[PDB]
Amino acid sequence: EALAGAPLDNAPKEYPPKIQQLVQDIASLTLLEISDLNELLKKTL
Amino acid sequence: FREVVEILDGKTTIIEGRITETPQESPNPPNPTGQCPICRWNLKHKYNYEDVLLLSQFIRPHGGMLPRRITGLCQEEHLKIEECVKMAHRAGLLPNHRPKLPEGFVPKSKPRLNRYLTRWSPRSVKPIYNKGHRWNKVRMPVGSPLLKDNVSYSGRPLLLYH
Amino acid sequence: HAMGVNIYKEGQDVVLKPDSEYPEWLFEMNVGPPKKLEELDPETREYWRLLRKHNIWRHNRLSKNRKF
């Protein structure tokens, strides 16, 4: 494998795709799953 | 080939290095498996002081020489190149590789003595006043012992001391 | 100053703690023979330190004929 390319502050625009796919996986859920997710995150942290 | 330019613009000095396009090696050497540049171009024991076109390749524009780490030559052939460049410089070849100093060209001296095959320097040889007979003779060296390994088409050895 | 150590004077001159308070590593190291080159493991940094010390000894023995 290989490591990251280390972008800098001159042209920083590239967010990681893991963050975007986690945002989409959150946003594809209903409010009962929002409450379950919030309870399971409050219990762990 | 990298050049440096020094610029003075109102108590500000700017020093810059700029790359100029350099010529490359010829594509097909006759002996590709040779390491050394002369010994792969099969010019070993071939060139002389007269070969201006090859001695112009391994020299600076101010008449200086390039180191063996840059040139890639084997040590004996680098010494042969150095001796032949010195011999051509005292022989009057390479007239355009002298440094420019426009104040000094105008005050002419006595005309330049025509010479060639000079192993030594003109300024450091004492005249042979005493000379000698045949059973002890002070022989003036002509050419250099570094170039005795050149090929002989006549078959006779090159007379280096006469 | 001068002090003579006796049966009481060798224990009352300082705080003599029991051996169980003391660690293992003071009993671990050697006392009397310094470690030689052939004894130590070749994958030990102290072995290469000893070899380097022998190299400085060799260099000092070689540099005895300096004219400078």
Binding site: A6, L8, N10 | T12, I14, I15, E16, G17 | -
Partner: protein, 97 residues
């Protein structure tokens, strides 16, 4: 490191070295920075401040000094070698000031 120490760099006010370490042509700049930041050069005079600016996408390796003859020497070492930079630096900054 010794050439700047012998020459008396007490006439120099400010040094800055701005470079990008992730490039390939800044090693001469790093060597020149380590030359001007050595111990004897530092203890030649205590009133001279040296600054080591580190960037990533600045894309210009450079050194810039100011000294009290009204002079500012700026040279961008990208193709220059460290010996050339040291020689030009000394032969300007000790001849002037």
């Amino acid at each position: 490191a010794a050439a700047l120490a012998r020459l008396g760099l007490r006439a120099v006010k400010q040094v800055r070295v701005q470079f990008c370490p992730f490039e390939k042509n800044v090693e001469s700049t790093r060597t020149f920075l380590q030359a001007v930041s050595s111990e004897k050069v530092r203890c030649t005079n205590l009133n001279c401040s040296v600054i080591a600016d580190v960037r990533h996408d600045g894309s210009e390796p450079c050194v810039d000094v100011l000294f009290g003859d009204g002079h500012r020497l700026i040279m961008r070492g990208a193709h220059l070698t460290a010996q050339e930079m040291l020689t030009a630096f000394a032969s300007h900054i000790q001849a002037r000031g």
